[PDB]
Amino acid sequence: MIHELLLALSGYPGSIFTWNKRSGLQVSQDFPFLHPSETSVLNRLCRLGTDYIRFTEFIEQYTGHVQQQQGQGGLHGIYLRAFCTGLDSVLQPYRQALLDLEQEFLGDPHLSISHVNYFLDQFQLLFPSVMVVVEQIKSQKIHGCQILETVYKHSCGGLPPVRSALEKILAVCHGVMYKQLSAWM
Amino acid sequence: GHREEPYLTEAGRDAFDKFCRLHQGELQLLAGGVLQAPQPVLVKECELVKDVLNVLIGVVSATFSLPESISSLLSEVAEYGTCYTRLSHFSLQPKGLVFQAFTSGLRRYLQYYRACVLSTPPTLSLLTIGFLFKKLGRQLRYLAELCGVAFPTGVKLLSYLY
Amino acid sequence: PDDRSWLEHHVVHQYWTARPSQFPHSLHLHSNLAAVWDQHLYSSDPLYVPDDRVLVTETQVIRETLWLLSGVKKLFIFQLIDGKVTVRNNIIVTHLTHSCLRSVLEQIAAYGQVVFRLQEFIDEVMGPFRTYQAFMWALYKYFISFKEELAEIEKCIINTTITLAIVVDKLAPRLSQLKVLHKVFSTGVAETRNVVRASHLLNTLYKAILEYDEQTVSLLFSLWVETVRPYLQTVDEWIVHGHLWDGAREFIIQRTMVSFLKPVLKQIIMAGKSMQLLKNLELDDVHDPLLAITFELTLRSCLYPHIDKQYLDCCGNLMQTLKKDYRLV
């Protein structure tokens, strides 16, 4: 369960975390030695790995897969590509936290699961925020510069990690707009 | 004292392979023995570290051919090497003169890739190697879509890359 | 054998499953108390009443109590029937006669309901109001450090002598603190439009700090800052950018009354309306150093110069550019 949790959270589904698209990651939870206590902390942990899979799949799916083969600005185009480029760098402390957990496990493997949940609880509010940000762009066919407002009106929240996380991606999407302005004027 | 006898959820890498064996035993009972997977234990972490260190060279330990869940981890770092070799075979040829200059530029990028390995890791962990070569690996696989592995040569290349 | 032995020995598992538990002990009443009490009851001719309390050992009770006081759900001990967590009366240890146990687990279940209702409130925002959001964020910020304290105590069980009565006095400077938030939010849900439901909320903390103005006041004040965070952002935006913007009534001003900014509210409105008439021809970053250097009364009379001198500059500049170029005089 210790190395397997890291294997699942890295974005490679294990033999206990049954991969589905209607339940995401989910434990079997039918072992003849199951404890009632472990259930809730596992149900809390599965969601972040489920979100991480879709994020990495989105970024791979829509950035760096074409050589200029009508086109859409909420599936292709440079503003969505800038969104994905900012997106992957925002998920870097999630990776670095996963790298920090394994050193603690190598120091001693008898560590509490609530400690791991306590570590992941700061990403726990940020990830459901950015899911609706990608979902609105995908549903409403939001084209080009209208992406720039969409994150910007969603950065009027009051959670500090949401604001600080969105601002970098907004800076990249601003950078391409500055790049075209440097030529056109 | 008689030793409180801890939980199994706070134990793993010895309890993990045991519990995986139990899961496979329950599954092989529920199927009837028509599943039959080899090597339920092995490969470790550091041996796979040395193996993937050899994979980025362009050679294998004959694991591929043209715990056991780590293969689900391995494939995505495996499929990088399978395209990387497929560029060096596309540079095995010594053609147009602009095409020769193009292919020498591709070999000058392959030299960078060969230099990054054996110079950055003093045997780091597996997931660090995978994470560092995630943002770089898709960029290398992008160049396989760029290159041929007909493919244009001459003017039909010189306007295509332009 | 091979795998079932590694389970059977080293994993606890007997009592949270349907299985008779076997447990050796040192008999002779002082901790054999439950069996001696049952022997006396059967010797006094009950008649039968075949009580079935399966068994548990003592330390496992300690760790399940800590996981309940954390705020996570789904444990074997502590059944609940309507949303209020209560004792499971199916258990005996080797002592505690099933009546001392039924009382002490009831006392900690009373705090379990306190933490369970507030984590339910915290879950109902995690799956758009922008002051409730700041309030639940304040409670979340308290809760994460609280769960760190109990989680580090739980690691010291794997390694001193611990019982139930030790950990309740150990959590005393926090379980006293938890009872207050059960009272501040219950009046914040007891009470249509978002703005009256925000104003009666924000006035509650502002009143409740002055009520106790030792250590409880610092707790309430640390929640107060993280609840007043949106309002300061909006008053700064109304000052520097010269227009008020609401998410369909985000302020009591339309471009009943809160007592937090009332003694300078007049100085704020003449600040807004003067600046837009100036546009036709920062303050967070001075409030936050003020927290570095009677409490929430005269200290709030130190906030008011920051907006008052800024206002005098704005309205004086409007006056200066009206006495020349459309010169009234």
A112 vs B contacts (CB less than 8 Å): 10
Q: Measure the N-to-C terminal CA separation of chain A; round to a whole number of Å.
A: 59
Residue found by looking up tokens 């130190």 in the block: C302
Q: Give the separation between CA C99 and CA C95, rounded to whole angstroms.
A: 10
Collapsed DSSP state (helix, strand, coil) of residue C205: helix
Question: Per-residue DSSP letters for A59-71?
Answer: HHHHSSS-S----
Residue C80's beta-bridge partner residues?
C85
CB proximity list for A134: less than 8 A, separation 6 or greater: A55, A58
Closest CA to A62 of A27, A87, A45: A87
Closest CA to C244 of C265, C261, C269, C226: C269
Exposure pattern of C277-304 as b/e (b: 16+ CB <10 Å)? eeeeeebeeebeeeeeeeebeeeeeebe
Q: Report residue C237 CA to chain centroid gap.
A: 30
B140 vs A contacts (CB less than 8 Å): none
CB C261 within 8 A of CB C235: yes
Closest CA to A46 of A136, A134, A129, A113: A113
- Sequence letter at residue B60: V
Q: Give the separation between CA A41 and CA A53, rounded to whole angstroms.
A: 20
Q: Give the separation between CA B20 and CA B147, rounded to whole angstroms.
A: 43
CB B88 within 8 A of CB B103: no
- Up-side HSE of residue A112: CA atoms within 13 Å toward CB? 21
CB B16 within 8 A of CB A1: yes
CB contact under 8 A, A113 and B20: no
Q: What is the 3-state secondary structure (H, E, C) of C58-73?
A: HHHHHHHHHHHHHCCC
Exposure pattern of B60-80 as b/e (b: 16+ CB <10 Å)? beeeeeebbbbebbbeebeeb
* Nearest chain A alpha carbon to C144: A118
Closest CA to C237 of C288, C263, C276: C276
**DSSP label at C263?**
G
Q: What is the 3-state secondary structure (H, E, C) of chain B?
A: CCCCCCCCCCCCCCHHHHHHHHHHHHHHHHHCCCCCCCCCCCCCCHHHHHHHHHHCCCCCCCCCCCCCCHHHHHHHHHHHHHHHHHHHHHHCCCCCHHHHHHHHHHHHHHHHHHHHCCCCCCCCCHHHHHHHHHHCHHHHHHHHHHCCCCCCCCHHHHCCCC
**To the nearest whole angstrom, how far is the Cα of B160 from the nearest Cα of chain A?**
10
Q: Helical H runs in C127-215? A: 132-158, 164-170, 172-184, 194-212
A111 vs B contacts (CB less than 8 Å): 10
Task: Give C101: exposed, middle or buried? Use CB within 10 Å, 0-12, 13-18, 19+.
Answer: buried
Q: Give the separation between CA C79 and CA C105, rounded to whole angstroms.
A: 11
Q: Give the separation between CA B154 and CA B151, rounded to whole angstroms.
A: 10
CB A41 within 8 A of CB A144: no
Instruction: Inform me whether the C-beta atom of residue B146 falls under 8 Å from chain C C-beta atoms.
Output: no
Closest CA to C84 of C111, C65, C61, C121: C111
Collapsed DSSP state (helix, strand, coil) of residue C80: strand
CB contact under 8 A, C130 and A158: yes
Q: Give the separation between CA C221 and CA C198, rounded to whole angstroms.
A: 18
- Sequence letter at residue C111: Y
Q: Give the separation between CA C205 and CA C203, rounded to whole angstroms.
A: 6
B21 vs C contacts (CB less than 8 Å): 3
Output the CA angle B73-B79-B82, nearest 5 degrees: 145
Residue found by looking up tokens 């306190």 in the block: C114
Quote the tokens at residue C30: 């002082």
Of A37, A125, A158, the CB nearest to C134: A158
Contacts of C among chains (3+ CB pairs under 8 A)? A, B
Q: Does C47 sit behind a cis peptide bond, omega within 30 degrees of 0 on the bond before it?
A: yes
Output the CA angle C21-C26-C31, nearest 5 degrees: 85
CB C114 within 8 A of CB C182: yes
Q: Give the separation between CA B158 and CA B43, rounded to whole angstroms.
A: 48
Quote the tokens at residue C248: 């369909």
Question: Per-residue DSSP letters for chain A?
Answer: -HHHHHHHHTT---SSB---SSS-S-B----TT--HHHHHHHHHHHHHHHHHHHHHHHHHHHSSS-S-----TTTSSHHHHHHHHHHHHHTHHHHHHHHHHHHHHHH-S---HHHHHHHHTTHHHHHHHHHHHHHHHHHHT--TTHHHHHHHHHT-SS-HHHHHHHHHHHHHHHHHHHHHHHHH-
Q: Helical H runs in chain C? A: 2-10, 33-43, 58-70, 100-126, 132-158, 164-170, 172-184, 194-212, 216-240, 265-279, 284-290, 304-323
Tell me how many residue pairs between chain B and chain C have CB atoms under 8 A apart. Answer: 23
The data reach a resolution, in angstroms, of 7.0
Collapsed DSSP state (helix, strand, coil) of residue C322: helix
Q: Give the separation between CA A156 and CA C288, rounded to whole angstroms.
A: 20
Residue A27's beta-bridge partner residues?
A17
Q: Give the separation between CA C163 and CA C92, rounded to whole angstroms.
A: 16
Residue C168: left (phi > 0), alpha (psi -120 to 50), or beta? alpha
Name the method of structure determination. cryo-EM
Q: Give the separation between CA B3 and CA B62, rounded to whole angstroms.
A: 47
φ, ψ (nearest 5 deg) of residue A17: -95, 95
Q: Give the separation between CA C267 and CA C238, rounded to whole angstroms.
A: 12
Residue found by looking up tokens 């103005």 in the block: C213
CB A155 within 8 A of CB A170: yes
CB A117 within 8 A of CB A40: no
Number of Cβ within 10 Å of residue C319's Cβ equals 11
CB contact under 8 A, B4 and C59: yes
Backbone Cα Rg of chain A: 19
B145 vs A contacts (CB less than 8 Å): 65, 67
**To the nearest whole angstrom, how far is the Cα of C153 from the nearest Cα of chain B?**
16
Backbone Cα Rg of chain B: 22
Question: How distant, in Å, are the alpha carbons of A69, A76, A152, C164, C221 from that of A143?
Answer: 19, 9, 15, 61, 46
